[PDB]
Paper text:
Ureases are nickel-metalloenzymes produced in plants, fungi, and bacteria, but not in animals. The active site contains two Ni2+ ions which are coordinated by six different amino acids.
We have determined the structure of a dodecameric urease assembly, a metalloenzyme from the pathogen Y. enterocolitica at an overall resolution of 1.98 Å using cryo-EM. There are four large oval shaped holes between the trimers (64 Å long, 12 Å wide, high electrostatic potential) and four smaller holes at the center of the trimer with a diameter of 6 Å (low electrostatic potential), as shown in Fig. 2b, and the center of the enzyme assembly is hollow. A tightly embedded kinked loop is interacting with neighboring domains and is potentially responsible for the assembly of the oligomer. Furthermore, the high resolution allows for a detailed description of the nickel-metallo-center and the active site. The distance between the Ni2+ ions is 3.7 Å in X-ray structures of K. aerogenes and S. pasteurii, but only 3.2 Å in the Y. enterocolitica cryo-EM model.
Residue numbers in the entry:
A (entry chain D), B (entry chain A), C (entry chain W): 1 to 100
D (entry chain B): 31 to 162
E (entry chain F), F (entry chain C): 2 to 327, 335 to 572
The structure:
Amino acid sequence: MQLTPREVEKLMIYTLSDVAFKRKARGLKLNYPEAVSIITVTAMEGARDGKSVEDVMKEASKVLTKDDVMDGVADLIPNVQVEAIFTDGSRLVTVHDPIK
Amino acid sequence: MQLTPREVEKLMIYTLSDVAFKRKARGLKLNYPEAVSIITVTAMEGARDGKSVEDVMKEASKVLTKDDVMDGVADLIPNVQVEAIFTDGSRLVTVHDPIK
Amino acid sequence: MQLTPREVEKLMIYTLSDVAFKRKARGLKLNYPEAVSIITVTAMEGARDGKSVEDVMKEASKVLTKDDVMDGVADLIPNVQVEAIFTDGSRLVTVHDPIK
Amino acid sequence: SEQNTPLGGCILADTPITFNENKPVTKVKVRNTGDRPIQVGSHFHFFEVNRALEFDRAAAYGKRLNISSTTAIRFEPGDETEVPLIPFGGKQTLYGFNNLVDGWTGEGVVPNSERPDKLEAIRRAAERGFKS
Amino acid sequence: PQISRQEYAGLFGPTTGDKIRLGDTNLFIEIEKDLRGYGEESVYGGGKSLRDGMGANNHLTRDNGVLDLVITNVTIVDARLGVIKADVGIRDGKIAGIGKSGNPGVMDGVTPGLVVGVSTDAISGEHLILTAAGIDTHIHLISPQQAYHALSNGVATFFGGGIGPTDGTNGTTVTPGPWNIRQMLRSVEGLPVNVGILGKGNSYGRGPLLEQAIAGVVGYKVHEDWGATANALRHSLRMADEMDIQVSVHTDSLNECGYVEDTIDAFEGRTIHTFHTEGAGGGHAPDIIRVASQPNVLPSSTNPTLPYGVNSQAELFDMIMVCHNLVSFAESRVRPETIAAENVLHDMGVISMFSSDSQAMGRVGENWLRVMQTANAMKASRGKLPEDAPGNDNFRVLRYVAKITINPAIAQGVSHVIGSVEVGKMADLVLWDPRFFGAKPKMVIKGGMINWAAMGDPNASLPTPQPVFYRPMFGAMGKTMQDTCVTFVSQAALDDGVKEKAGLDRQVIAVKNCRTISKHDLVRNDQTPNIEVDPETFAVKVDGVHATCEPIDTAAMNQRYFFG
Amino acid sequence: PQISRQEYAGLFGPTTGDKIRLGDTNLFIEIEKDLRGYGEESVYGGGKSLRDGMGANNHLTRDNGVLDLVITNVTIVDARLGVIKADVGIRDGKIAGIGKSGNPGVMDGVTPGLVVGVSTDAISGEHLILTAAGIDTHIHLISPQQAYHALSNGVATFFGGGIGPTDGTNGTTVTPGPWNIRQMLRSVEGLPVNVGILGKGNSYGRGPLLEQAIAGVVGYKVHEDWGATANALRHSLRMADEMDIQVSVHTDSLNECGYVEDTIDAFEGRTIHTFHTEGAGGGHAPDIIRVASQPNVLPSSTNPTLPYGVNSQAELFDMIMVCHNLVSFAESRVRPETIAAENVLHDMGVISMFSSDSQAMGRVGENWLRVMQTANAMKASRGKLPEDAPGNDNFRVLRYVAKITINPAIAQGVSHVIGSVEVGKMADLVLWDPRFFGAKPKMVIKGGMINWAAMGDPNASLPTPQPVFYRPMFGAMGKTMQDTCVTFVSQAALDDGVKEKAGLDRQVIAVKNCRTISKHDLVRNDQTPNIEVDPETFAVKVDGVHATCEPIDTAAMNQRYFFG
Ligand code: NI
Ligand code: NI
Ligand code: NI
Ligand code: NI
C-alpha cells in the first residue's frame, strides 16, 4: 500500500475517534483529545466523501455541542486544524469555535 | 490534542481489543494477546466511566471465562496490570486470576 | 502481552481496514491503500479462523470487485501478499489478481 | 504426570530437601519490648538485631536464624518466640550490620573458654543499648 | 496615548495586577512586577517591532553581546524570582538577562545584555508561562523511554540509577560499580535529558565507595534491598563529605537492625536526602515521617500518594502485594493516616521535594501534573496559606514549584547551573499555555535549543494541524543532543579525566555544595516541626496538631486533558 | 531443617530431578545437576540474602574479581553444559563462572569467581531459563529492522550480506566489493546485533577475492544468481583456506554446469557451508540433500519448511512462482518428499543448523520458534530418540538448541567468543519464561548489558503494566550499543587495520577455526549417513530407510501466543 508518513500518522486520528464515538454514544461527556478527534475525522471524512472545504467546515463546526463535552473543553478548543485530501488535493481545513 | 507518549501507547490496546471483541463474537476462542487486551480495556473503560479501582477490578476479573479462551491461556495470564486514568488520577489496577 | 515487532506492525492493517470497510458500506469506491487493506485482513482473518492457505486465497481473491474500487486501482494491485499465522505456522499468502 | 502439567509447569519429585543439617543449633527466647513490629531475615547477624529485642545476646554471637534462605521471622510487639540459631559459614567474618563485631566470630581453638574479642563485643552491645 | 487593559492584554498579554488561572484549578497567580516598560513592546512579526533597524539592531556583530534567542512578553513563574512579566534572553546556551529587550539605538530602557540583533531568534511569550524545567531526583533506569514521558511533562533532569530492567534496578536507584557506571555514562549519551548517576552505598571500607566516586557518580544510594544498615549509612556519609557528593536513603521497613531513631543516629547529623519520607514507598514502619523534623534531612516524597484520593488505599495495597510478590507487612506499609499527613506537610513546607520513583511505584510523567493537583486539593481543604496574599495564590504555587525545580537542584548540588530562571544559568526551560499549565507543555528548551515539542503534521502547511503529539526537535538531533545535555559527575571524577576516559561527548559538570546544606537552605520548604506518630493508630501530630485531610474524588488537570 | 520440594520450588525454583514443560509443547526437560548447594541460596530482595555483609561482600573492591552481574538460581539449557541449575556470573562483559554465588566470609561453597559484592547487580533466575543467544547464518541485509524482529525471538548474531533492497540482495547474501563492504561495516554500527559480512565468491583469479578479504569479510557466498560454477567453488575455497574464512553455497538449481555429484567434486574435500540443504530455497534439483553425507559439508536448512505442515506445499509453490516472477521448474523445486525428509534428518542429527534466509523465503523472527516447533512435531511422529532417557526429552531438546547456538558459531569460526553458556565467553544470553520458551523472551543480554526487553508503560508505577512490547534498552543506547556489539572480520582485515581504516567503534574480532572443521566437530548433529534420492518420485532413503513423516495440522507455540 506504500504508506507514507502522512498516511500512517492519520491512523492515530481514526483510532482515537472510534473510541470517542463509542463513548459519546454511552452518554459520556468528552474530553479534549476525544473532542478534537471527532471534529478532525468529520472533516477528513467529508473530504473523502467529495465535499468542499467550505462545506466540510460547516459540518465539523456542528458535530459537537457544549452539552456533549466536559465543562471547559470549549476553552481548550478554540479552533481545530487538519489537512485532508480533497478531490483537488490536500487542503487545510480550519474549523472556527467548533463547540458552540 | 497534544498527545503524550502514554496517550499514544494506549491506542495499541484499543486496536487489539476491537479485533478481539470481533473475534469473540464470531465464536473464536481467544489467545493470549487478545485476552489480555479485553481485560485491559475493560478496566480502562471503567476508569473513564468513573468507577473505583475496586469496582473496575471486579468487572475485569469477570469479562472472560475458561470457555472463552484457548486451552492453557489462563496459565499465561495469572494477573493483568494496567494504569488507567481515574477521576482522582492515574492508578494501577491489578486484576488477579482474570480467567476463571 | 509481549508484542513483537511483527505483531505491532499488523495493527496498522487492522486500523486501515476498519476505515475501509466503513467507507465501502457508505458506498464509497475505494482507493489503493484501502483496497489492499481489505484483501490483506480477509486473509489474515481466515488464517485465524483455521482455514488453509488455499482456502483463504480464494476468499481474498473474491472480496473486492471492479465496481467496488476506483477506476484504475486494479492496475495498481496485480497481486497482494501477506504473512499470516495459520494453525501450522506463519505462511505467505499470495492473492493473484484480487480485483476482478 | 505430564498430561496434566500447565503451560511452563513443573513436575516435581517427592523427596524433601534437607538444609543446614550439619550445623549446631542454639535455641534462644526472644521478646519484643518495643511498640513496633520487628522482622529479621535468615542471614542477618542475630546478635546485632534491633536494640528493642531482648534475648541472650551472647548466645547469638556468630549466629543466624536456622530458617530457609530468603525468609524471615516476625516479632510483633510484646510477644515471645523461641528461635533456632546456627553459625555462619565460610570464614565467619562479619563486617557492618550495627558495627558491633566488624570481624571474626569463630570459636577459635580453646573448648571451655571464650576468645576476648567476643567478650569485648558482648560488652559493647551492652553499653550501645542492645538488650540482654 | 491611553489604551484599555483588555486591548493591551490581547496584544501583549497580562501586566502587573492581572491575574491568571492555572488550568482548571482554582489557583490564580498574579503578576507582581512588569519589567518591560510600556509603548516599546518587542514582538516578532510582519509589520511589528523586531524588524531591522527598529526594535532589532542591525549593525552589531554578535560579540557585542547580542542575543542568540529572546522570549518576549512572558510570564515567569519561578521560586526565586516569583511571578513577573519580562523579556528573557539567551546567549551561549545561558540566561543573559530578564528585563526589557530591544535596540538601544531607537529605544529607551533596554536591559543590558538584552540587545536583539542579527543573531537573534524569537519566541513569543505573550500568552505564555515560562518555568524552569523540572528535576526528578528519584529515577529508576529501567527503560530509556522514560525520558520521553518526562520531557512531555516538563522534566529534563534525571537523578538516579540502574542498568536497565534487572531486579536490582527494579527495586533500587543504583548503578553498581565502576564497570556498570562507565557503561551507563556512555549509554545516556543517547538520551535527551541531563543525568547524574547514583552508586551503591552499602560498603564496609572506603575502597568500594571511592571506586565509584572516581568512576563518576554524584551520589550514593542506601537501600534496604542491598542492606540499609547503620554501617552503610555511616561509611556512605563519611565518604560523601570527603567527595562532595550526596547520599540518598530508602530505610529499613522491617525494623531489623533498628527503629527510625537509630537510623537518625546513623546519619550522625550529616546531610542526607530521604526518598518517599512518608513510607508507602519504603521505610521504617509506621514512622519514617519523623525524619522531616531534623535539620540535616532534605526530604522528599514519591509522587503516587500526592494528591490523596479515594482510590489511593486500594491501589497501594494491591501494588505492594505485587511489588513484593506477596498481610501484616501490607497494612503496616499502607497507612491512610500517614498518607494524608504527607499531603499536609507538603502544604506546610515540611516535605521539600516531589519525585517519581519511576516504574518502581511512581510516574515519571506526572511530577508537574501532581504538584499542581496537590496545591489545588489543599487550597480546597485548608484554604489560604497564612502567608498568602488575599487576592492571589502566589505564595502557595511558588512553594509547590520549588519542589520540582530549585529544591531538587540544591539537594544534588546543581543549583549553580540549573533549577531557576535566573541570570547565569543553563537555559533548561519550559513553556506552557495557561490553559494546560502543569499537564501539557508547549516546549522544552534544553541548553538553549528546543529539544522537545508538541508538533502536528510535518507535511502540513502549518505546525498546528492534527495530529499533534510530542516529538523530538533539532536540539534532540545529531551531535547537538550531547552538546545541549549535561552529565553530572563528582569532582573526583572530573579531576581524574572521566570525560576522556569514558569518552563522553556530553557536557560534563562537577556537582558541588551538597554537604554544607540543610533543610533551611531549601526554598519555601524550610520548616522543621515536631512530628509524632502513634504506633497504634498511625495518627500524625505536627507541633501537637493532628495532620490530616480528606480524600479527593476529583482531580484537576486530569480526565479533561488526558486520553492516557 | 527439612522443607518440601513444592515449597523449595516456590522459593528457588526447580532442583535436580525436577522436570519443566517447555511451553505448550510435550517436551519436558529435567535438571541433571544442581550446582548451588542447599540452605545458602542467593536472592535479591528486601529482607533477603544478597544484602550487605551477608550474601554480599561489602569490603572487596572490584579488582578482587567481584562480579558486575549475577543471574541467580537459573536453569541453563546449553548444548555443551546440558540442563543444570546454577548461579551465573558476569564480569567485563564475559561469563566468569557458573556455580554457587555469594560471600565467602559468611558462606561455604562459593564458586571462585562468583563473589557478589558492591559492584554487583542482580537478576533473579528462579523461575527462568537461560540460553545462549542464537546465531542466524543466512541473513539477507535487505532491511535494517530485521534486527528488531530477531532480538524479539532471541537472536543476536547475523551472518550474511547485502546492501539494502537491491535485486542482488533480495536474492543473495553478498556485499560485493571493498566499497560496498566498507559501507556496510559502517552502517551496521547502527544495529544492536553482532554482524559478519559475506562477500561474492564468483571470481576467476585470487585478486577479486583477496580485495574483499582485506576489506573485512568473514566469508564468501557462492550463489547461482551470480554463477554457482565449479570455477567459483574452487577459487573461493582455495582462497578461504588461505584467509581462514568460510564459504557458503547456494548451488545450481537448473543443473546447467552439472549435477550434485559434480558440485561435490568442485568442493574438493574442503570445508563448506551449504544453505537450504533440502533444496526448496535453491539447489540442484531434486537431490542437493545428498551433500549431508559428506564429512566436509556443514549443513543447514532455512526455516520455512520446518516444521512440515499441511499448508507447506501450497505456500512454497506460490512463493517461487512469485519469487522468480513466473511450472516444471516449480514442481521440481517444491517436493513434498524431500521436505519431509529434511524434518527427519534434523531429528537424526544429519542437518546441523537452522537459518532464516531473511526476506528471501524465510523468517528472521522465527528460528527459536520453529526449532521448538520441529522438536515437538517430531516427538509426536517418531517418539523418543534412542539416546533419550526415558523420563525426559533432554537429548532431543539439546540437539535442536545446538542448531541455533553452538553449531552456527562453529561453522563461521566464532565459537571461541560466542554460542554457548560457558566460562570465558561473551555474555550473549537470553532469558525466557518456560511458559513462553522459544517464542517470547524476557530479555536479551548483549555484551553484559540488557539491550532488548519486553517492557510495558514507561509512565507506569511498575515495569509490567500494559502495553507490554519489545523495546530497546540501555545496552541499545548511546555509545554502549557499539561497545557491546561485535563486528566480525577476517584476520587479514584485522591485521591490515580495518578498525582504523573503516573507522569502526564496534568491537572488531577476527574469525578463526573455519577450515579444519568437519561435520563431526558439530555438536549433537554429527551424523554422515548414506542418502539416496529417487530421480522420479523424489523419495529419500537414509542408510536404505525411507525418510518421511506426515504433515502437522497444528503447531505448538503458535496461534495461542501470537497476534502477528
Ligand atoms: Ni525507595
Ligand atoms: Ni526507588
Ligand atoms: Ni540461497
Ligand atoms: Ni538466501
